[PDB]
Amino acid sequence: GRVLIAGATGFIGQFVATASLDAHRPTYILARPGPRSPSKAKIFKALEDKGAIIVYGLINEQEAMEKILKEHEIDIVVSTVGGESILDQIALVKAMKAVGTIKRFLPSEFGHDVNRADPVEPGLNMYREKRRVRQLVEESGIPFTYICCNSIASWPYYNNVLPPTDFFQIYGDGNVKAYFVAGTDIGKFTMKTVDDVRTLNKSVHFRPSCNCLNINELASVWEKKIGRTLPRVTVTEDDLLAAAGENIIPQSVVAAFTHDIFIKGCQVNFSIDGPEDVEVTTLYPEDSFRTVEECFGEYIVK
Ligand SMILES: NC(=O)C1=CN([C@@H]2O[C@H](COP(=O)(O)OP(=O)(O)OC[C@H]3O[C@@H](n4cnc5c(N)ncnc54)[C@H](OP(=O)(O)O)[C@@H]3O)[C@@H](O)[C@H]2O)C=CC1
Numbered sequence: 674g675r676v677l678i679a680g681a682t683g684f685i686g687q688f689v690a691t692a693s694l695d696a697h698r699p700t701y702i703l704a705r706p707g708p709r710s711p712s713k714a715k716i717f718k719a720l721e722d723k724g725a726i727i728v729y730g731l732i733n734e735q736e737a738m739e740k741i742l743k744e745h746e747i748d749i750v751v752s753t754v755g756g757e758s759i760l761d762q763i764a765l766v767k768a769m770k771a772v773g774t775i776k777r778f779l780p781s782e783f784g785h786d787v788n789r790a791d792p793v794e795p796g797l798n799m800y801r802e803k804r805r806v807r808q809l810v811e812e813s814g815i816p817f818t819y820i821c822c823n824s825i826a827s828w829p830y831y832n833n834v835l836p837p838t839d840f841f842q843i844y845g846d847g848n849v850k851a852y853f854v855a856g857t858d859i860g861k862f863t864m865k866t867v868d869d870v871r872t873l874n875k876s877v878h879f880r881p882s883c884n885c886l887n888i889n890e891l892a893s894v895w896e897k898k899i900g901r902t903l904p905r906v907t908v909t910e911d912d913l914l915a916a917a918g919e920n921i922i923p924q925s926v927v928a929a930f931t932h933d934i935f936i937k938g939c940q941v942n943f944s945i946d947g948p949e950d951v952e953v954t955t956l957y958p959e960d961s962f963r964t965v966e967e968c969f970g971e972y973i974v975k
Contacts, residue, residue: 686753692860738768796929844935
């Protein structure tokens with residue numbers, strides 16, 4: 674099963690691409706034509722050394738994408754494009770529909786369940802775009818999997834990776850749970866889903882029970898790691914709504930999602946027992962997630 678990843682030089686994309694190559698899956702990486710940044714240069718080299726095949730194009734160019742999917746006999750398409758580029762996926766979906774040979778598409782999800790969560794603006798606009806892509810995918814008859822992996826295991830700053838050394842900003846009561854997942858686990862478990870019969874036309878939720886922490890708990894894990902306590906200060910709901918209300922992109926987007934998670938409980942407030950939802954830890958039993966303690970341990974080694 675040949676995998677095409679768009680957005681492999683991106684934050685999430687680097688983890689997904691590396692996991693695909695480490696799983697011994699034939700892996701093709703879409704590259705923007707032109708000169709290469711030092712960091713892009715770094716990433717593309719690492720991936721090619723792991724056996725990645727670089728292909729040149731842009732996902733908003735339908736005819737170009739049709740040619741690539743056909744020429745390279747692609748089976749599985751994974752998009753990890755950024756928030757600014759969500760509607761660039763429209764041409765890619767039309768291209769996949771035209772070629773008709775795609776076995777699984779994973780659009781650029783990699784956070785919350787955009788069909789259940791209701792963030793304030795401008796987070797909401799991003800979710801409108803993601804929902805529009807899901808509507809197009811489903812109406813196009815493309816088999817899909819939606820990766821709802823919740824938060825990457827970093828410190829959740831309102832404007833956003835390394836936890837604080839001076840004082841902790843605690844959102845609201847600091848007693849609202851979220852799920853934190855290592856980057857490497859987002860990649861590993863994403864790639865397992867692409868050809869699993871059980872994830873076909875499903876939302877895949879990442880709910881590792883040992884990494885279900887509120888902000889007060891997350892603070893305490895960091896204090897254990899640095900061997901000292903810090904002052905805790907409150908950031909109110911209205912603080913976050915003010916920040917969101919300025920409509921400064923992407924800072925205000927991050928503020929809106931912080932509010933949704935840590936004020937409104939968007940990651941934990943629904944059941945996954947229904948027939949269109951599956952959960953990673955029950956799909957792949959006896960395959961432990963890296964803990965937050967472990968993750969914070971490598972931030973310490975920096
Ligand atoms: N905590 C969480 O769960 C988080 C989840 N996310 C979600 O992950 C997804 C990816 O975001 P992130 O990792 O921040 O994004 P990035 O901006 O780090 O990476 C985006 C990748 O998409 C590529 N790309 C963008 N447009 C095109 C295009 N038209 N054609 C081909 N390639 C393109 C970029 O290449 P180039 O540089 O050449 O333009 C880059 O390689 C988003 O849906 C975001 O919402 C991400 C961060 C937090």
